[PDB]
């Protein structure tokens with residue numbers, strides 16, 4: 218692949234969807250942090266169904282703490298691992314109240330310190346709630362980057378590091394959401410939708426499927 222081809226792929230993804238975002242519903246950084254903590258081994262539609270019940274009754278660290286571990290579990294019992302999720306939620310709300318004064322902190326090490334949130338999660342929250350140029354790589358973005366040859370790599374860290382070198386600064390805030398929505402709905406794992414792909418003539422995959 219090369220610089221000019223990469224730039225035309227990013228130009229077509231912007232034309233198609235100028236402002237890509239998460240499929241998790243949220244109206245605040247805190248509501249995004251909790252939705253992302255509820256995401257582990259669950260679908261976005263499962264999480265949105267649970268937060269549609271929960272956030273009208275408690276959507277601040279203080280209201281959440283007042284609901285308690287067992288009150289939280291009542292609203293999220295439909296989601297996988299909800300007992301440990303409910304513990305991580307209450308603990309994170311306490312830390313935000315004490316150390317960060319009821320705010321979600323705009324800082325990677327502070328977010329990574331929170332129970333249940335790791336590097337990829339901190340990067341997704343900094344990008345999606347605060348607009349940071351971070352580009353977290355999951356299995357979808359890994360498959361898309363290697364199939365197209367946009368940013369090939371042998372594991373997650375190599376693709377993440379290549380993406381931070383090859384994506385122009387202009388495109389780095391929307392890059393993660395463009396590539397994950399492309400992987401989820403077009404460049405899917407079993408039988409890619411190549412005959413209907415908006416970047417098919419720029420993609421370098423040798424096994425394209427419906428011409």
Ligand code: SF4
Pocket residue numbers: 364365403404405409410411414415416417418420421422425426
């Ligand atoms: S042409 Fe096929 S392999 Fe290439 S990006 Fe599109 S869907 Fe994926």
